[PDB]
């Protein structure tokens, strides 16, 4: 019946879509997800949340998912919506591989999910998918690429971006310290740790609290390795060493 109905897709008198804006707020509450692009490789690092001692941690990184051999994504937002979208992304990549026997390029995957996300806003009187995800991938057509998809269905190709709780602060640090045309994944990894230390209120950036995954092309194979906690620990110490060196300068 009309009385028990939520408009969901109806336009505001202002002209904005109210539900989509509300969904964006949910992404803001979710944990920090940050991506930095370097010429050698593209990396996605996200902050683990609700790290209670009893959790098994057997999911091989809850935030990070591998959509295809050459593509990966991390999502901030309602977990249930994320699981539905991550499965859909994997199917779209596979369906392309069968129709044309070549891996999906990247923007095509982002646009295809984005088309679904917009469709929910467009019609059906149904709740929008309140999830925002960053896509890191390599393609023959345009090399390493990074993309961000909003709940609205609009997408972007940012070389460096953050979609988590402290996104405004992370982007400001990224804009100032990202060196365009300078690669070195190691420099990008250090920048990521510094952004994470600012974004995370908890000090010391504990290795368990953060997850880091790096996509690099080796021997023409594209390897989405996930950094081990020991690798994360050495990186945090390196950030501390730089902070200590600044203290020595002071």
């Amino acid at each position: 019946s009309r009385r028990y109905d939520s408009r969901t897709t109806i336009f505001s008198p202002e002209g904005r879509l109210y539900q989509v804006e509300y969904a964006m707020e949910a992404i803001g509450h979710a944990g920090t997800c940050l991506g930095i692009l370097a010429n050698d490789g593209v990396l996605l690092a996200a902050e683990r949340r609700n790290i209670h001692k009893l959790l098994d941690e057997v999911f091989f990184s809850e935030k990070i998912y591998k959509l295809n051999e050459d593509m990966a994504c991390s999502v901030a937002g309602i977990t249930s919506d994320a699981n539905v979208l991550t499965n859909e992304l994997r199917l779209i990549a596979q369906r392309y591989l069968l129709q044309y026997q070549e891996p999906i390029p990247c923007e095509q995957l982002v646009t295809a999910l984005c088309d679904i996300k917009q469709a929910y806003t467009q019609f059906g009187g149904k709740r929008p998918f309140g999830v925002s995800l960053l896509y890191i991938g390599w393609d023959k057509h345009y090399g390493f690429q990074l993309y961000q998809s909003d709940p609205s269905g609009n997408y972007g190709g940012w070389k460096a971006t953050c979609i988590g709780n402290n996104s405004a602060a992370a982007v400001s640090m990224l804009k100032q310290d990202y060196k365009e045309g300078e690669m070195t994944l190691k420099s990008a990894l250090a920048l990521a740790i510094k952004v994470l230390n600012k974004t995370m209120d908890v000090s010391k950036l504990s290795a368990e609290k953060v997850e880091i995954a790096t996509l690099t092309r080796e021997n023409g194979k594209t390897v989405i390795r996930v950094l081990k906690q020991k690798e994360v620990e050495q990186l945090i110490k390196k950030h501390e060493e730089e902070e200590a060196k600044a203290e020595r300068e002071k």
């Binding site: 539900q19 509300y22 969904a23 009893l54 999911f59 977990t79 709740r127």
Partner: protein, 234 residues
């Protein structure tokens, strides 16, 4: 005569951005009777407290701990009828995997598939979100796996967890113990103790229902075995 019915989601994003109906369903899980799940290195132990209001009710007729498959079992906190609908659905999903792959469903896989059904209710129209949170347990590839699925459909893997009345106190009680070096499932005693901490008048073989999943499989402990464990419970 109304056919399929309402096609508009009853759950919608708040101005804050948190779905209100899912939060209300969480309240039913907290309001539910206490359920405790502990995973020991040999096997998971699922314990829930069933206190029938009167002697008239036959406790044996209904089991809160149920076997989804030979190696997978479920315990619930929240509305009872909804748990039965999920339990039937989970058994169908587990059998469909077996038919396609000719191998018993991996424990994690059942949770994702059950969770996907739970998420469907939240997005889909007319249906209210489920009011039940489950603590699925399984023994695939030797290692025991304990997982919890919330009404929203988010699934988390827990070495130990508790849901229902005084869940927070239960979580702290488990935090004090749960060293997780218990090669044997002596955690059956600890699970009885955590339910006992929030238990009301007494703990009896009828009062507590316990199901254990080991290398052998998921077996609901016999009422006599629950009495033996309830007896000499420290």
């Amino acid at each position: 005569m109304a056919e399929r019915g309402y096609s508009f989601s009853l759950t919608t994003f708040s101005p804050s951005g948190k779905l209100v109906q899912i939060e209300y369903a969480l309240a039913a899980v907290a309001g539910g009777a206490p359920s405790v799940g502990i995973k020991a290195a040999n096997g998971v132990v699922l314990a829930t407290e069933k206190k029938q209001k009167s002697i008239l009710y036959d406790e044996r007729s209904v089991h809160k701990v149920e076997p989804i498959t030979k190696h997978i079992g479920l315990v619930y906190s929240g509305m009872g009828p909804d748990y039965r609908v999920l339990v039937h659905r989970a058994r169908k999903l587990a059998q469909q995997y077996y038919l396609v792959y000719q191998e018993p469903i991996p424990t994690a896989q059942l949770v994702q598939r059950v969770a996907s059904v739970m998420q469907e209710y939240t997005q889909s129209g007319g249906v209210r979100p489920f009011g039940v949170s489950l603590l699925i347990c399984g023994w695939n590839e030797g290692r025991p796996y304990l997982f919890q699925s919330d009404p929203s459909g988010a699934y988390f893997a827990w070495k130990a967890t508790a849901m229902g009345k005084n869940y927070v106190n239960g979580k702290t009680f488990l935090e004090k113990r749960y060293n997780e070096d218990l090669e044997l499932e002596d955690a059956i005693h600890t699970a009885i103790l955590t339910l006992k901490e929030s238990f009301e008048g007494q703990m009896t073989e009828d009062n507590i229902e316990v199901g254990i999943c080991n290398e052998a499989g998921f077996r609901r402990l016999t009422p006599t075995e629950v009495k033996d464990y309830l007896a000499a419970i420290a």
